[PDB]
Paper text:
The cap intermediate is methylated by the RNA guanine N-7 methyltransferase, utilising the methyl donor, AdoMet, to create the mature cap, m7GpppN, and byproduct, AdoHcy (S-adenosyl homocysteine). In mammals, RNA guanylyltransferase and 5′-triphosphatase (RNGTT/CE) caps the nascent transcript and RNA guanine-7 methyltransferase (RNMT) methylates the cap. RNMT also has an activating subunit, RAM (RNMT-activating miniprotein).
Moreover, only low quality crystals of the RNMT 165–476 monomer could be obtained using sparse matrix screens without proteolysis. Thus, binding of RAM permits stabilisation of a lobe structure, RNMT 416–456. RAM binding, however, stabilises the RNMT lobe (residues 416–456), a domain missing from structures of RNMT monomers. Despite the absence of the lobe in this mutant and in thermolysin-cleaved RNMT, the crystal structures are not altered significantly compared to RNMT–RAM (RMSD 0.5 Å).
Residue numbers in the entry: 167 to 363, 367 to 416, 451 to 476
The structure:
Amino acid sequence: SRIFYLRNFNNWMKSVLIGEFLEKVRQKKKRDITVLDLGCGKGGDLLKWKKGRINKLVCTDIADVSVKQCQQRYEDMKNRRDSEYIFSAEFITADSSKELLIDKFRDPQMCFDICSCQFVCHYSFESYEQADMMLRNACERLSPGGYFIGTTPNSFELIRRLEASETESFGNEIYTVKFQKKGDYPLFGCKYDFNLEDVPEFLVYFPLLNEMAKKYNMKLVYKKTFLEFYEEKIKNNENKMLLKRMQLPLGTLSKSEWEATSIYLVFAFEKQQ
Ligand SMILES: Nc1ncnc2c1ncn2[C@@H]1O[C@H](CSCC[C@H](N)C(=O)O)[C@@H](O)[C@H]1O
């Protein structure tokens, strides 16, 4: 109702992102696709992976109830009738910032063509170790040429609104951000409250994320604001009538919705050879 169109939009953003890199993986002649969905939540991306026609998915999250719900929705998905091919799936409760996923994989030798981290990475920036660990978990088992893709708040946009504010808070009808306070932005542990009409988040300084990713032999493919990404993707009609069947620019979202969503960026990294 209130944020339905915002959610819809986020789903559309993820769809097109996931879509783009599934094709890139396939154009490198990769037949059977293996994917790690890191911080999978309740399975909002299950259907995107099913229509990407991947062969194996690992869903993991720190919240077990979410993992279990993700599993049940998966069970329902291919207990549908005359349901075309579905990936095999593996479900793991774990803190991907404090625990090594390879130690919990049923198959410890397993590799991935894509790690998808959607609206997750920023939780790991509580400390250097947690950040490095989530990056490791996202990137260590990636095959060369494989991709690390995701969505996280854009720190530049967050700071800009903070410093433009009369307080340590800012927002509108839809969202509210509250810093522990402005002027002080440590690389790790920069805490702010994020309210979508409620969970603590950490600032992700992207040039820092870029450097730390190098440790795992990753090179940046691109980084784009939600706005830029939105503007580019709709010059292709497959995506736009996709968006309309799923149901600042004048543009598809109210000005307040645009303020909420324009907070985010999309990124992709590639595993080097
Ligand atoms: N340290 C951590 N390790 C793994 N998952 C975490 C985490 N901290 C938070 N999360 C999870 O990240 C999720 C963010 S909401 C994103 C859900 C899903 N990827 C989607 O796009 O719909 C939540 O499910 C939360 O439980």
